[PDB]
Amino acid sequence: PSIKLQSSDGEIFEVDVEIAKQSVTIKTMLEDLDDPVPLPNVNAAILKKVIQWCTHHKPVWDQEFLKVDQGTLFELILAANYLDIKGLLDVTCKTVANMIKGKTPEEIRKTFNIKNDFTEEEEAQVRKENQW
Amino acid sequence: QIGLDQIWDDLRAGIQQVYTRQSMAKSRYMELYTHVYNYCTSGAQFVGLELYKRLKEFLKNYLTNLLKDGEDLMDESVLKFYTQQWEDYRFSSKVLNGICAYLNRHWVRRECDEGRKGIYEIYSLALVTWRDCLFRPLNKQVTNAVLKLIEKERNGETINTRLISGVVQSYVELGLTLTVYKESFESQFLADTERFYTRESTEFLQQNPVTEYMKKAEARLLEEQRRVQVYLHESTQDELARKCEQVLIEKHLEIFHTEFQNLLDADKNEDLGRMYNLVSRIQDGLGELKKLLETHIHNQGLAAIEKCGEAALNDPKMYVQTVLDVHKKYNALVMSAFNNDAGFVAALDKACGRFINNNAVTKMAQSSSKSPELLARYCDSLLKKSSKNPEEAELEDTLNQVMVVFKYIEDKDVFQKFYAKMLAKRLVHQNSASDDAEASMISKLKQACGFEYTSKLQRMFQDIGVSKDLNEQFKKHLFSIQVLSSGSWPFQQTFALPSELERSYQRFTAFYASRHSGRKLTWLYQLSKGELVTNCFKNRYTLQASTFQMAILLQYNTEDAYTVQQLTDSTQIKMDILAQVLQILLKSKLLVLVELKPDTLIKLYLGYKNKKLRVNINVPMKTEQKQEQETTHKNIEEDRKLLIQAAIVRIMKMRKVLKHQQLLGEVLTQLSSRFKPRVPVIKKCIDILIEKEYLERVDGEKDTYSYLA
Amino acid sequence: KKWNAVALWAW
């Protein structure tokens, strides 16, 4: 009952038979099918963080784990997409939604790396329909 | 990030590896998955539209190319080709569906909600592509080949059952449910089954006897159930069973009826049970069997009774035993073959009643009351001594069987009266085979009759017991006596008491006067018997005779010849009784003188020779029974009239005004436990009641009676 | 010798 997971950087980790089953990708791949399986997209130790989270969930601990920078959060979201883990994707989405909840519409343009792409008439019209 | 063209060349090669099943690399799976993921991530405006068309084209080409290989194959060839190709396609399709799970998670889900019905999941896409490409051209060949294989298996050969199971599974899964399975396989299956079983049944019945066809049919049905259990879908059970039952039994019921009659003529229990099991599965098909059974039992009973003829009229044992045997055989047949079915027991009961209450014996006697009388006489014959002590176990069974027969007799009053008379005669003369038999019969009569009759019988028993106790007590105070009550005994009461018993008579009269006051003893002499000691014979003779015979043999001591004109005055006996007893004496070979006149001379045969000293000259009188039968029948008729009149008054005293039909029905159901009255008797009783000012007819509304005080 | 008679009692 030994399964191996290989990241892009090439380092080999250890995953139990009941640890990787949280991700449905590995679940179905083992369901219908001694070697390292290379995952092209996941990089560095984000795989180790995913393993840590899936072992923890084998609230407050969510914020405790996710008290990280934007890049780590984005990498975790993409990892959740790759492995198709429902809980991790949901918790990352909720964390981002709280990160935008109670924020000024002017601030997001500066803080979430999006240059404003709109016309003055377009902005006036958008403000007009949003009167509700 | 990544365009479609950059990965499609590698993706085609990767998907080709999934098909043509081989060892699948543990890493090539993720290598193929990553290309799909990178392509799919580059109002919703999703991205995965273009890959679906290419996948559809690839599957189209693969299916057409593989179909080109096996377009012209034969039975085993098409079965194998289809089975392995189907397994490989299913496995590879599931793997491919796993590879492209991102599309299934997002793009097809989005297109399903919008309303586009042409988009499926990739596994369902593979199945629908198979159905559209390969299933259509080969379905007829595969179905016909499977049908031929099944037909071969039905004629006793051995086939590869795993081949059909794969085809059935493929048909069931291709209903994207049982739409395809019903319209592509079941129709042909059930169409060919009917023809095969029709020809098989006709050929089998043309040569083999009809009895073995039942075993053949039951084996066929069990085999069909097993086949559906082993290599067919479970949903076909009821349809196949119904079709087989139809084609095997419903057409041949017409000859099944004649077969049933023939197997009734000659006993065959297991075959009848098999027929009952077969025809039971047809709804409302058992009625003809019941009617034929009832008619057969009726005719058998009449034929068996008519065989005996004149002998059965005066031989109770034969008459009862014929009926008992006819009932017993068919009752065992009903218990065993037909598993205690209510309809069959009802038919047996109706037939038994019909041939018990009307047969050849009854026509000989011109009345329907001979059967209860013969049953009562048979009970009396059983319960007497009869030169051998019966075994307790055997007697109880006969009594139970008699009670069973008694249930089907409509005229129970005749049986009750005759049994009461015979029990009285048995108890007075003290000749009972066993007391346990009397007790058991009394208990059965308690269970299955009224309460007044039981009360009278119990009073008879109590009187005999107290008389025995009184005799035992009075023996010490000093021949036996039987003191009985007045109204509880059926005996209906001129005798010169001999001086030999005058002292005993006076002593017993004084004893009864001293013990009890105000009670007068009426002495019955024609039911009293004893013994004699004689002197002027060859030697010491001991004889058994009636008290009238006691007096008429003790009247002459030294004289021999007497003239019956003086003998009548001497003995104080009427004409007919004296003549009958004198004829009995002459018939005893113990006197010398058949027409009797008052001047006729009758002497004594001196030196009479007898083979045995123990002689019983008190033979039963032949004419007495024939004279008594008419009297008791007339008494029964009078009692019937009185009961009918009382019932009519009772029913009219609760309902003030009533019609004719309701009155007759109520009277019949009220008297149903004693006898079945005749309508003319009821009409005559009503007419008499109207005359005697008890009930009147209302003016108008004819055929209506009203109660009048 | 021996005798067995039967009689009824009534008022």
Next chain:
Amino acid sequence: SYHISNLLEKMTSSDKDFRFMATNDLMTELQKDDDSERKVVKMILKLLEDKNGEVQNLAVKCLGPLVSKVKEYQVETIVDTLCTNMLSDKEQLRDISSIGLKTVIGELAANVCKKITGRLTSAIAKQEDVSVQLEALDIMADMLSRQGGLLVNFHPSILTCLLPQLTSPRLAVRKRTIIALGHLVMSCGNIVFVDLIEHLLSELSKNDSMSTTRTYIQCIAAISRQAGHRIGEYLEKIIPLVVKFCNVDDDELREYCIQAFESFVRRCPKEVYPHVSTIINICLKYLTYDPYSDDDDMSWKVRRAAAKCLDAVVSTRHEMLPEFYKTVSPALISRFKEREENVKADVFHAYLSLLKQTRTPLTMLQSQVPNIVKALHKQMKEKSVKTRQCCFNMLTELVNVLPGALTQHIPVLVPGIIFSLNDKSSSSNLKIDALSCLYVILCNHSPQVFHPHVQALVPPVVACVGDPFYKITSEALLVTQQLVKVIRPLDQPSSFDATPYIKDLFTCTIKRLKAADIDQEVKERAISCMGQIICNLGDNLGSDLPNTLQIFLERLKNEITRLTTVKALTLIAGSPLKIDLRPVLGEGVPILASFLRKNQRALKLGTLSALDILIKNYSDSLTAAMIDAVLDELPPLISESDMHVSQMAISFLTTLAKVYPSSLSKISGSILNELIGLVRSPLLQGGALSAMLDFFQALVVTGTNNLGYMDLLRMLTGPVYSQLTHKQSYYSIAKCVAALTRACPKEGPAVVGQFIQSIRLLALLSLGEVGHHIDLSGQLELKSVILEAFSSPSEEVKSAASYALGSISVGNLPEYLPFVLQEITSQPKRQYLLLHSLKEIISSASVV
């Protein structure tokens, strides 16, 4: 809500008619209303006491369905008031209450029985009124019979109530007390049974008034007959009393003691052991007692009881059987003339039990046969069917146990069978028994004895075949077949002329054969009988043989009839008298070949045997169109799943090779592949290998194309040189090659080439098999080969070398035994191989 009130109010109208009508009407409604049934229950119970008789009848009847269609406490109340009424001072009330309570119990649960039992105890104990005692005892017996295990604490009370009632002047009370005690004993406990047995013993030990002794001994019989076990503990004390009481001149006491003896024998195998002789002596002594008819005889019950006890003794005790034949048997034989017809059957049954136990005693039984025959001869003339049936059963069993029994009594026993066969008043069962006895008599005696009686045996049996009842015809045909065997045997010389009877037998059997609608049993029996008729006496038959054979063909096509016809064809084909089956053979063997693929083992074996004899005896009329058709379906049968069918197929191939060689070219395809696979199977042993060797030997002699010795060697030694995980395959291959060599006059170069050489293991095995019965002296290299193979690391190779050396020594003893002895005595290193070779030589040696 108003009619009920009206009826209840009207039920006390001071008029009998109103009360009767109200009760009848209310029963009419309560045949398909709450908190008011306390009125209807009370009124029914009150009307139980009504002055009018008819109202009382309705009241007692109404309790039947009322208990079913009422609430719960109402049933308890009615049961309680009936039980209380049963002890009242009114006779009519007690009678009506007892009847009603019986009716309530009959149509009915745990509480009601316990409620009843307490009062019913005092009801039974009351001796003032004798009538109610009978119903009380019957009710208590019914309560004990069903759900008697629920009562576990009323047992002392019921026993103390029941015990005194074995004395009442009415015998019915005694009988029902006995029945109740018997039911109680089935589940009573230790103390209850102990007390009951002690009371019974203490009353029988010092008992006067012998009228009570009868019921006491009946009770001690019933306790044994119902309880069974748990009575032998006191049996050492009970037996002296019962044996002591048997001498009294009481007819009734004599029966019950013997019945107790029988119960003790059947239910106490160990405790009755010392007194079996005493029981036997008493039974033998009393078996003979027999010193408008109002006699009331009872002297036959004692005889019946004695016979039943003798039967019980015989059927149970076996270690001392010769005593029975010494003493018991002559008395039973002498008592075959007993007048009463219900004890004759009993003594006959005793003798049948003796015969069934007889299975040295055999000579003792032999010594008494003439008396048996003399006694039975007069009994066969009786007018009673039962006596004759039992006599026939006795004869059948006597012949079965002792084969050569009735060798001399044929001309005094056959007339009885003839008389029974044609009797106006004879029943069907008697005729069936007579025919079965005739069959068993004919089977187990030499045919010589029955020769003079054929003129008197044939007509009755021939007439009996025509009886409309089918069960009679079955046995008639079964007898006719053996009669045909008797009238003209084949395995023994004979001189009896048999011409006048063939026409009658043929005519009576052909009508039953050409029926197609009679019962299946009759059809099968007719087929077998006609097969035997043609097999034995078919030469004298005229022009009807072709038609009979055509019918035989027509009977090969049904599915429930063909197996019997296959066996009949096998029997008729292989007979000393060679008759013409050729017209059948034209269209027969295709069908027999077709039967091969029908997954039925019996049909396969039968058709293979039929084909074997048909080929062997009718070779001159075979065509190539049928033999290849037969050969087609052989390959599916040759498989390792079922060895027997494969062996039969090999036997058929061997017969074909020995008979008709030109068709052997058709096997060189898949058949040889199947055979090669079968040889390689790890299961071959027994005679199947011998059959395969015989087939190879017969095939190589024929010398057809592609089947020469070199060719057969090529097929046999193919997979060996190709690159077989079981050693037995190499043994079988070597044996086949050796057998083929043995058949061939010359195989010297092949033997030498094999001697030149896992392969070397096969070479050694081939050398050993070739030397198994043939001397290989002219080689001068076997010793060198054995020496070379001696130095082997493996143990299997060493065993193969030892076996080869032993087989070579067996082949040439003078030229090898000194060599083996010298090798054994020269090199101490090689000792196990010499021992194995010596053991093989000893085991495989010939006569000299």
Next chain:
Amino acid sequence: VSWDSLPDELLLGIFSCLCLPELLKVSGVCKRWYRLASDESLWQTLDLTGKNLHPDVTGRLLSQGVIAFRCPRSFMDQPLAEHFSPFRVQHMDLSNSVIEVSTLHGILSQCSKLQNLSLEGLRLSDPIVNTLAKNSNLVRLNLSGCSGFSEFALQTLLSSCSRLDELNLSWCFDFTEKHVQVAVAHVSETITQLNLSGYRKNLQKSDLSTLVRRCPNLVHLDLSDSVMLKNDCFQEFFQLNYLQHLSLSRCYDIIPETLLELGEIPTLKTLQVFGIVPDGTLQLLKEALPHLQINCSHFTTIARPTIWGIKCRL
């Protein structure tokens, strides 16, 4: 880093847990998220009770494909000048809300597959009923307090609507004898709950008998404020076999002692007869009929928005 390259799928996941002012504010950061600001996934259910608005914004919001929108007690007193394609709403309730008759008629003219509706207190016209006759899949409907309808329009709607399960056509202050008769005659035979209270001088025994003999699957009934009830009405009600709920409030035409006849119904569970039964007699009535409950449901439950089991999120 850069968020502009992030896939469009994850934006729905981010936006799922997001309140109404929150997305209404974030939609202005860029057109890229403006495209997904209005996606059918987010607007699964909408609830804007008490929030006053204009018909144009309501139409713009409803056009996106709202499944269940409930806007009661809202202010909609302004003309509508926008045109939109037919909508796909499946659960609408606007009971007691203040809206314009012309605006309501225009808004309902685009709804065709509305599985449920509620118009308690709304004022409509003949065109409104004609447009509502198009919705042939209306399982539930309400007509309490509707004003402006006509007898011909009511009969046409009753003929068009046959699959309706429960309805409440009570408290109609503009009903006429012809309209009531047409509603009774053209009623569907599968109606489970029927409320026709308020017709004191317009309800006839013949209409009740026709309704009883037409629809035999009535589960709950309401006949409050009816002064035309007698033993014939009781017999007609007893002719039904599923009388699980009946109402005869203010039935002065039925004697209090006659209420015992309602206990013969085997399927009876509750009955509101408030107004006729005198005080104190409740105990005697309960003693006579202890297998049911009287005056246990103060409020009706026919076509009650509180939508209809759908839980709102936005």
